[PDB]
Amino acid sequence: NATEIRASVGKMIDGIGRFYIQMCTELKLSDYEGRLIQNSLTIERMVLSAFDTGGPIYRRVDGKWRRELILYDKEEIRRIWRQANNGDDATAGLTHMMIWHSNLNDATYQRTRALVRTGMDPRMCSLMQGSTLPRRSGAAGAAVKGVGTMVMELIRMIKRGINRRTRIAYERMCNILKGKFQTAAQRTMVDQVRESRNPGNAEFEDLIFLARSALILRGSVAHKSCLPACVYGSAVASGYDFEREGYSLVGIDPFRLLQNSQVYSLIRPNENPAHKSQLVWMACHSAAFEDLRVSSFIRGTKVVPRGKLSTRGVQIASNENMETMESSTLELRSRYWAIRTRSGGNTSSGQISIQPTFSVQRNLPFDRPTIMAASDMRTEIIRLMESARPEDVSFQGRGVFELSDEKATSPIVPSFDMSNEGSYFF
Known part of the structure; x- marks a missing residue:
């Protein structure tokens, strides 16, 4: 059903x-100045703030870039917003930029200070997808969250409490949690946790376990390709009428759109442009915890690790100066594309006999034992954990698609026998 899903999300994209x-027309910005991921960001945040203000706005004068500090009627912003969405709220829309920011933050920064202070191992990076994402995020906003993300919450919710209506949250927060797991025990053990009203260190210690189980027996976490406002603004302005032509966040739509985007970015004096583009590109698809090998494969070019990355962040701090500041054109094109997945990969009182109702060749079932016959769920997982090898192939048969292959017709299988450059962005 490509009607609602493909076109309703198009309508949310049209709004943005x-x-x-x-909003560009108000600020009286230019074309080049509306394509500046910097300004776009500021605008996006002006809005999410107002629906839950001012910001940094960079201008272009003969030669050099001028930063303007401006403020707007928090309500005016809310007014202009609905005007664009037909006077609707389009929470989806705000939530969308709510993620674009998330996915950018999960790639620009490493959130160790918080994991440890919570009592999570800093090496649990690949599980903190969407830790920055405000709780205000919607229902399809949390689906993007990593297993580890959920744990940091409950643990704090629990840690301060164990140190009214708050209950329905906890159970649900776990149900979601549990819905991340895709194996018997995993699923069952989550329940054993959700049993306690005042879950103390008993739970505190157990979920942390389950957190680590996901490092091996991963869960289902959706990835959403959420591009900067400017990219959608520019597209809308170019005629693309997405609600009519349909759009996706996990198909070929987002890559194709980025195949023509003209996004510019402010770049500090010693920073590497190629390195800058990389960053943004990884935020456009929630590839901050992906295997660098594959990211580079699909990307088309080296996807260098965070440490070796030359850049501190895309937003410009009030500290810096404009004199020594210039701007480059972001390389967001990719070689192939791939279905952004959700899956993490993987490798009595009852009846005892069957009463036959039809005449067919059928082995008739009965439980030989029970008839003639007259622990720690951790263990289960730890035992599963074990048989698991890092070499264990996932998404068997799934491949990559050419950018011409609009339909999911012909898949391409990558062979990594190659002089790679790592697998852990962090």
Whole structure:
């Protein structure tokens, strides 16, 4: 059903576009100045703030870039927003930029200070997908969250409490949690946790376990390709009428859109442009915890690790100066594309006999034992954990698609026998 899903999300994309265009028309920015991921960001945040203000706005004068510090009627912003969405709220829309920010933050920064202070191992990076993502995020906003993300929450919710309506949260927060797991025990052990009203260190210690189980027996976490407002604004302005032509966040749509985007970015004096583009590109698909090998494969070019990356962050701090500041054109094109997945990969009182109702060749079942016959769920997992090898192939048969292959017709299988450059962005 490509009607609602493909076109309703198109309508949410149109809103962001239209709005970005309106908002650019207010600031009286130029074309080059509306394509500046910097300014786009500021605008996006102005809005999410107002629906839950001012910001840094960079201008282009003969030669050099001028930063303007401006403020807007928090309500005016809310007004212009609905105007674009037909006077609707389009929470989806705000939530969308709510993620674009997330996915950018999960790649620009490493959130160790918080994991440890929670009592999670800093090496649990690949499980903190969407830790920055405000709770206000929607229902399809949390689905993007990593297993580890959920744990940091409950643990704090629990840690301060164990140190009214708050209950329905906890159970649900676990149900979601549990819905991340895709194996018997995993699933069952989550329940054993959700049993305690005042879950103390008993739970505190157990979920942390399950956190680590996901490092091996991963869960289902959705990835959403959420591009900057400018990209959608520019697209809308170019005629693309997504609600009519359909759009996706996990298909070929987002890559294709980025195949023509003209996004520019402010770049500090000693920073590497190629390195800058990489960053943004990884935020456009939630590839901050992906295997660098595959990221580079699909990317088309080296996807260098965070440490070796030359850049501190895309936003410009009030500290810096404009004199020594210039801007480059971000390389967001990719070689192939791939279905952004959700899956993490993987490798009595009852009846005892069957009463036959039809005449067919059928082995008739009965439980030989029970008839003639007259522990720690951790263990289960630890035992599963074990048989697991890092070489264990996932998404068997799934491949990569050419950018011409609009339909999911012909898949391509990558062979990594190659002089790679690592697998852990962090």
